[PDB]
Structure formats: C-alpha cells, structure tokens
Amino acid sequence: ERELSASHFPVVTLEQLPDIRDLERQHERGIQHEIERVKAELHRLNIELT
Amino acid sequence: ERELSASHFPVVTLEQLPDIRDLERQHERGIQHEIERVKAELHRLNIELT
Amino acid sequence: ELETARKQQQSLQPVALSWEKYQKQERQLADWLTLESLLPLWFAQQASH
C-alpha cells in the first residue's frame, strides 16, 4: 500500500508542512474528480450494455 | 445562499473554533455522501427509464 | 388501429413517469450540489467571525 500510494502521490519537505495538509486535500479532490470521471464512463457503458 | 447554508450548517463556539474545520470536513463528507446517493439513485432510475 | 395507438400510448406513459421522477431527482442533485459549494463559503464566514 505504501509503495502504491507513494508511486502516485508526491511528498514535500518541512517548509510547507501546514500547507501539506491542504495539498493532501487537494490531491484527494483530484482523486475524487478522476473517480467521478471514471464513474461517468461506467454509467455510459452500463447504459450501452443494458 | 446564506439562509440555506445557515439552515443546513451549524456554527461553533469560541474555544471549539478549531473544531469548526472538523465540522467542515464532516459536512463536506455528508453533502458529498448525499450527492452520490441521489446520483446513484438517478443512475438506476435512468437505467429503468432507458 | 385503435389497439396500436392504445399500446403505443400505454408504453409511452411509463416512460413519462420515469422521466419526470428522474427530473425530480435531478433537481434534488442540483440543489445538493449547490449546498456543497456554499459549505466552504459559509464555514469560511463563520471561521472568520
């Protein structure tokens, strides 16, 4: 899990540590954006399959 | 918008002010949870409609 | 001919039902989305205060 998350997720040094929480949250926002994009594709494909 | 946000969202006391951002995360999670729940019901409903 | 029109309309009506309830859920989702965006603004107002 750690290798997997790291391979996708950047890590930053101490100089922005308070902002690293907001960077994690922005990364989560982007992850959810990709989630909804893929889910919209799944919606379309489920329509076609049905 | 302020009326709606006040009716749906709470406000926090002075010293529990640090908790307000825990409430921000919790309310965001709840709003997104209901958004996705209604969205999935709309998904299945669209399936039935098609 | 009467039976044909009957069946066509009868099949179409449930489509209208599903379409309308889908519209209702769509409006509900739009409103929920509206609240999501207002949440940062509201809690920002309250946090500033």
Side-chain angles (χ1 to χ4, degrees):
Chain A
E1 307 178 329
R2 192 178 292 93
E3 191 285 329
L4 174 63
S5 55
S7 56
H8 297 108
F9 296 164
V11 185
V12 181
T13 54
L14 173 59
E15 65 262 11
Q16 292 163 69
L17 180 49
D19 282 352
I20 289 174
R21 296 170 168 155
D22 291 344
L23 281 160
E24 183 285 328
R25 288 203 283 175
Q26 290 160 12
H27 210 308
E28 192 182 72
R29 290 169 192 293
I31 293 168
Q32 189 274 331
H33 189 93
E34 301 315 297
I35 280 179
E36 53 79 18
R37 198 200 302 278
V38 172
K39 187 70 73 76
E41 173 56 10
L42 283 167
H43 169 280
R44 195 184 70 90
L45 294 195
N46 187 36
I47 277 174
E48 203 70 0
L49 187 74
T50 51
Chain B
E1 303 179 328
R2 181 171 286 104
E3 184 278 330
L4 306 153
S5 61
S7 56
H8 187 193
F9 310 142
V11 59
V12 193
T13 55
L14 174 51
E15 213 61 63
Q16 297 197 242
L17 174 51
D19 301 329
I20 203 161
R21 287 169 179 157
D22 290 330
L23 274 295
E24 176 188 272
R25 286 174 274 271
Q26 289 154 10
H27 278 282
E28 183 151 35
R29 175 210 47 64
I31 289 175
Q32 186 60 255
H33 181 278
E34 293 317 306
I35 285 167
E36 59 78 18
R37 164 61 280 151
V38 302
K39 179 63 216 72
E41 211 59 25
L42 181 142
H43 186 274
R44 188 216 43 58
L45 179 57
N46 193 0
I47 298 296
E48 210 66 34
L49 163 63
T50 306
Chain C
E1 290 151 49
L2 174 61
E3 286 300 299
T4 291
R6 184 183 211 152
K7 289 159 219 299
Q8 294 293 110
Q9 153 186 334
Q10 180 274 350
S11 57
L12 278 167
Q13 287 180 249
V15 172
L17 182 63
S18 301
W19 164 233
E20 187 52 29
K21 64 200 302 182
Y22 173 101
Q23 295 216 92
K24 300 289 94 176
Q25 300 313 318
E26 179 269 324
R27 295 317 308 144
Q28 184 179 6
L29 181 139
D31 301 339
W32 273 106
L33 168 63
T34 301
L35 275 296
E36 188 280 333
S37 71
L38 294 185
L39 181 85
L41 281 65
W42 161 263
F43 277 98
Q45 291 290 329
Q46 296 305 333
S48 163
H49 187 192

